[PDB]
Amino acid sequence: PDLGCQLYLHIPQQQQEEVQRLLMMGEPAKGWQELAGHLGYQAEAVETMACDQMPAYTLLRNWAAQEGNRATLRVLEDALAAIGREDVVQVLSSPAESSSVV
Structure with a gap:
């Protein structure tokens, strides 16, 4: 569950490179x-x-x-989302893991 707040600008290397490669x-x-x-x-x-x-x-x-400034990645996700880029958002913000074995 989401109680605190994941790192927006301090995202993990995995997510960092994932987005960088996505755009390119x-x-x-x-x-x-x-x-x-x-x-x-x-x-x-x-x-x-x-x-x-x-x-x-x-x-x-x-x-x-x-x-x-205090601007975060959110500035990009929003600025881009305005164009209607859900695909990239789905790949960057993939779904969480499940409980079942598969």
């Missing part, structure tokens, strides 16, 4: 530009991070680094 999944995105602009990223910025190899990590890093 083999499947071609269907709205990368709209995302960059929507977030408020300049053409120079989007092109900068894009050039790198780890855009997911660089994006979240530069974000919290530049913002230096």
Whole structure:
């Protein structure tokens, strides 16, 4: 049961890499530009991070680094959820374990 509160930004390496790979999944995105602009990223910025190899990590890093606020991963899950990305949310927020043997 949920009584306390799992780690949002302090998520486990498993969940961390899981999301990073998800965004860069083999499947071609269907709205990368709209995302960059929507977030408020300049053409120079989007092109900068894009050039790198780890855009997911660089994006979240530069974000919290530049913002230096108390913003958490929730900012991404929400900003993205607005587009209607439930698939990624399901893979990232998979269901818990069961009691039965199988």
